[PDB]
Amino acid sequence: YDYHFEVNGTVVRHKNKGFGYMERFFELKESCDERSKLSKKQYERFNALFNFFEKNGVICMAKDSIEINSLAYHGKYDVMKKFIEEQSVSIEDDYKKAFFLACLGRWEESYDLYSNIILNSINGCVYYLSQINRYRIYQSITQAVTQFNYKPFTDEFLARIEREMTNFNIDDLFNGMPFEFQKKYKILEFLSDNQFLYDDTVKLFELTNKVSSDIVVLLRLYDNLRFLYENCLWSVSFHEFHQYIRNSMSLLIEKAEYERTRDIDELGFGFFMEYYDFVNISRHFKIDDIKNLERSCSIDKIRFGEQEKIEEYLVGIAEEITKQFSANGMNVVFYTQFISEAKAALYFAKYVKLSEEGLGKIVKALLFYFPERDLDIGKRYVWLERLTKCNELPKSIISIIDDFLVLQAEKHEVSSNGLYSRDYGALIKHFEKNFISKRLSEITLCLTQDKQKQIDFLFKLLPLLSTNAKSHLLSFKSVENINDLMNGIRIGLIDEFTPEHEELIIEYLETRKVNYIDYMSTFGIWYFLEEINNSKMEEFIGMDDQYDFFVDPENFDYKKFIPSWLKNYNDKLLGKIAGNKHMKHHVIEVLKERVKNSNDKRYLEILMNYFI
Amino acid sequence: CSIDKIRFGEQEKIEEYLVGIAEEITKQFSGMNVVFYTQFISEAKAALYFAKYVKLSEEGLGKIVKALLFYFPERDLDIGKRYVWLERLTKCNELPKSIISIIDDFLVLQAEKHIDEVSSNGLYSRDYGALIKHFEKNFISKRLSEITLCLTQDKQKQIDFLFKLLPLLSTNAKSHLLSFKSVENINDLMNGIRIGLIDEFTPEHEELIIEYLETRKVNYIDYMSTFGIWYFLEEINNSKMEEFIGMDDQYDFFVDPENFDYKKFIPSWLKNYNDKLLGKIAGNKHMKHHVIEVLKERVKNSNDKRYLEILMNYFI
Questions:
Q1: Cβ of B266 and A268 within 8 Å?
Q2: Which of residues 53-72 of A touch B (CB under 8 A)?
């Protein structure tokens, strides 16, 4: 505590009452003559000290860019495998090898290498750090076994490490080292502690003040990341560090959004995201955390820099996804940690502009080689649609989606979201607007009445077929009764109501009218939407409030209106109701009354975009 | 958050705590402990500020108001900040006669002060008098009337300060004040209209407005927005206001909707506006679209609930 060493690289005298040796050192650093006056051995010692202080980002005193050198941090899995394959020349090479094995999911080999280094390492700093990391990898192996209860570790190995690590105390490790080590390496004692990021987490509270701190927080986060990755420490993978990164980045982005909002309020017209920030968010955030960030702050207003580096990182993520799942691959220990980072990276790639080739690689990996368990068809479509935000759909991505749809047809869908293969075709039709699928047409030409599952699958994908394919597909389905007509309209059998469909709807409505003493609401919606021009629906008025609310609002009694109707309405229906020039003030007043009664988010959203 | 609608439990314990803080404020500032002051003044200020939402008994309210007005240092609490505190206190409990008497004594002390008033938010003792007049509009400041009776023309400070507190006086007391004080500058005209002595501007008032605008114009190469509000709400028909646009953004916004570019509009302006002119802006139809856009953007990006209630009651 003689001096303060700040995150920006400046030194400040703090507590030493003796000579200013750091100020003196900087003075020799500035001027070569004073440096030349040193003795030869002291001159070379000063050269070593200057190299150290340059490497560690210590420049000068107060009166006078992040760069992490780690293959593990940058996700260079192939280069890490190459480094592991080669023969280690030193024990520091073995330490780096054991860290790389830990990061590649090969925890048994990592534990064996750490044990070997501990054997062959008795400064004793690599010995101490291997003891730290072997305990950490032993903790990782122990917790992975509990999660899996697949047998990725043999029971012999588990029993052997349990016997080796029984009664082992990491709290005694530093105190068991020679006192020379304990004096020289007092700064490494925190690595044996259960927690080491409490100071930073408590200091994060300054990002919540509403009355620089943010740059200090970011630089300290970069310092922690560089120390834990460049020194090959396995604590960089545990929940404490990931939680610390999540908290720091989330609070920084929320603080920047708060300053942006306050300035907009007070001035009426902040956070800069770069490659390292993108990698930190991808590796440490879950999808829920990114969703919290998106809902809390406008990430679309955050400028993304170093987009070439981010694109290269995303392409590497896609390539590793392919290598993990195109071939046998499937290191379950590595896959468990890697799939979360890949999901977060592809999810966050919505805000990053991507080149055509890189976008092609990423989209291909996402559509085909991403496991269904981690990303179902609905989540996969959500990721793709997010990818279509910054960059519109080119021809190559449309072709990749076409191949995905062809593969789906050949296979023929469990979707937690509720979006299926039809939405990919809708997305294609959104941009190309005239895309016809050659192979889908070919498989329609081979379709028969036997394979009903194919028919009921790609009847939803009808706009991507040709005229002959559409005509052939239409033959296998009948529209005899009203139920068949409703199944067709929900599946897309007909897009323009024929007069016989109108007669069928009339028959259904008359039959229900006779039996007076779900479908009717849809009929009223279609009548309002000009979908049906029968001009006869007025006789079915009186039963359902929605029916007369939709067929003719002029005579509708708005005391029978339920505000919950608007929640079920879609974008097109709400926009049409807004522009009707009738019914408008009634929905305005009912929505105003609803929101004044209770600040409901969906109702305000409806009232705000289309003004209904 | 609407903290006002949140109910407060243990109102008696809260009031006892508030009265204890008021008593400590009185005791400290009369020999004080400065290092204790640093920690305690923040808590006392926050408690007095947050006491807006808590029902206070008449005796406790009296003690709290007395401490806030008299013994709260001017360094921590400006006269405008102190008025804001007191006005917040009067929100939950309408100020009784004892509170009126206490703040009247504060007013007469402030009158004695001028015998030789910095507000960060521009709210002064005339506003304490206005808060007096907002309730029981039949009230007389006897001590202030006595001060008004003995007003020689040489002691300008007392008379010019007391002219702001016109409704607090009597006819006989205000006779001497009107004998000396009269509308002669733009400041006199604006504080007179805020009192309400003259409801309709004389042409000479428009002349002073135009000459003040001309002077600040020759200075070009704070009450700018008041003239814009007067032109928008057509209390000024001089029609020469259009020759001094490009001066302040609020002025440009209010004198002309179409010529005022909407990118320099400050969304926070709508919170200062009152209900009358806020409704008038909605019906103008010449600036309705851009205030609608600003309100929507603020509902999106800001957590402030004021913008939503501005949008939905007035539909600006």
A1: yes
A2: none
